Amino acid sequence: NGLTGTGVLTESNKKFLPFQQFGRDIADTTDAVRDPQTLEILDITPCSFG
Amino acid sequence: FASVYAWNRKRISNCVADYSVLYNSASFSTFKCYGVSPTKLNDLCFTNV
Amino acid sequence: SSALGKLQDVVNQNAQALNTLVKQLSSNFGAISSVLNDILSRLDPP
Ligand SMILES: *[C@@H]1O[C@H](CO)[C@@H](O[C@@H]2O[C@H](CO)[C@@H](O)[C@H](O)[C@H]2NC(C)=O)[C@H](O)[C@H]1NC(C)=O
């Protein structure tokens, strides 16, 4: 719903407080989201580069 | 419609708004936006309009 | 077992610089946002 990105999506275990849209990481990169339809938290690991 | 000095103000909520279908209702005389192209608005999402 | 500040100092200076480099990926420098998916998918290439 607006967040555009790339990466691997994985089942989370971080208790997104009932009111937290997403997860913010130090140095400010999106690293978790909540699925709008089912409302579950998913981590967004980065693809492989090098 | 309303007069200008007491201008109307509607607030839209949860809906499916197709902006391209609004774009070609085919009678307008000014359709100008600054923040964003109108055809690209068909794949965003907001909180309040 | 109970002094290695030179080594500590070095090991640190580098981390403080690498963090400042990443923390700059979230400044506008005079733009509408810091995200290209907000400037891109919100405007024309022109
Ligand atoms: C959008 O619709 C889906 C279903 O189409 C909603 O999903 C439900 O979420 C609740 C959680 O409170 C579950 O108990 C239901 O079983 C879900 N339904 C289905 C069919 O999976 C979703 O909540 C809706 N969006 C919002 C914001 O409420």
Q: Residue A44: how many CB atoms within 10 A of its CB?
A: 20
Which of left, alpha, beta for A39 (phi over 0: left; psi -120 to 50: alpha)? Answer: left
Amino acid at C44: D
Q: Mutation test of the interface with chain A: which of B36, B40, B45, choosing the one with the most A Cβ atoms within 10 A? A: B45
Give me the resolution in angstroms, 1 decimal.
3.0
Nearest CA to ligand 1 atom 25: A37
d(CA B31, CA B24) in angstroms, rounded, equals 10
Name residue A6's amino acid. Answer: T
State in Å, rounded, how far the first CA of chain C is from the last one. 65
DSSP state of C26: G
Q: Which residue minimizes the CA distance to atom 13 of ligand 1? A: A38
Q: Which of A3, B14, A34 is nearest to C41 (CA)?
A: A3
DSSP 8-state secondary structure symbol assigned to residue C18: H
> What are the tokens at C1?
């077992």
Query: Rounded to an integer, what distance in angstroms lies between the CA atom of residue A23 and that of residue A34?
Result: 9
| B35 vs C contacts (CB less than 8 Å) | 32, 42-43
Tokens of B18: 């197709």
Residue whose C-alpha is closest to residue A22's, from B40, A12, C36: A12
Residues written for chain C: 46
**Longest Cα separation, chain C:** 65
Determined by cryo-EM
Tokens of A46: 């980065």
Q: In angstroms, rounded to a whole number, what is the distance separating the alpha carbons of residues B4 and B13?
A: 24
Long-range contacts of residues A6-9, Cβ cutoff 8 Å, at least 24 apart = A6/A47, A7/A44, A7/A45, A7/A46, A7/A47, A8/A44, A8/A45, A8/A46, A8/A47, A9/A42, A9/A43, A9/A44
Q: Which two tokens mark B37?
A: 């192209």
